[PDB]
């Protein structure tokens, strides 16, 4: 009942590593509209990644996001009682957006010290397929695999 598809604004390439995902995750960890503070958090986390992993921070970040990045989504559809879920293949853009959102949400909840180290350690843990965003992706994947039967009927 809208019959119009929304436009899309430019993502902008990052001006340090020339990787758009860096700008995307900056905007995701944005709070109170503080671009400077978000950029400081990201670059400090990347420097801590340099100090710890002894590898390229952009490569480590890509290895983390690609591993956290899900495949199936379960859409809620109620008919009579409760909701029976529906597995659908997601577009690549929404796939990346969900990966970044999960990364930030599970990074801002860990027990550690300053958010710099928080997000840095979350990224290094997700780089090895052992983390909280990993658990989230596993849970949604297993739920979709369980409710594979109703995949044919969507709406």
Minimum gap (Å) between residue 59 Cβ and other proteins: 21
- Judged by beta carbon, residue 39 or residue 121, the one nearer other proteins is 39
Residue closer to other proteins by CB (options 109, 150) is 150
Q: Beta-carbon neighbour count of residue 143 at 10 Å?
A: 14
By beta-carbon proximity to other proteins, the closer residue of 105 and 150 is: 150
Min dist CB 140 to other proteins, Å, is 19
Give the nearest distance from C-beta 84 to other proteins in angstroms.
10
For binding to other proteins (CB under 8 A), which residues are involved? 15-16, 35-36, 39, 148-150, 152
What minimum distance in Å lies between the beta carbon of 39 and other proteins? 6
Q: How far apart are CA 96 and CA 90, in angstroms?
A: 10
Between 16 and 143, name the residue whose CB sits nearer to other proteins: 16
């Amino acid at each position: 009942m809208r019959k119009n598809r929304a436009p899309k604004r430019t993502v902008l390439p990052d001006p340090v590593f020339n990787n758009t995902l860096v700008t995307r995750i900056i905007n995701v960890i944005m709070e109170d509209g503080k671009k400077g503070l978000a950029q400081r958090i990201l670059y400090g986390a990347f420097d801590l990644i340099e100090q710890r992993t002894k590898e390229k921070p952009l490569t480590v970040f890509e290895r983390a996001v690609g591993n956290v990045m899900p495949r199936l989504e379960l859409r809620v559809r109620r008919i009579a009682g409760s909701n029976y879920q529906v597995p659908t293949e997601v577009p690549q853009d929404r796939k990346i957006a969900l990966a970044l959102r999960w990364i930030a949400m599970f990074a801002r909840k860990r027990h550690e010290k300053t958010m710099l180290e928080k997000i840095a350690n979350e990224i290094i843990d997700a780089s090895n397929n052992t983390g909280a965003a990993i658990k989230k992706k596993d849970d949604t994947h297993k739920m979709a695999e369980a409710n594979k039967a109703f995949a044919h009927m969507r709406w």
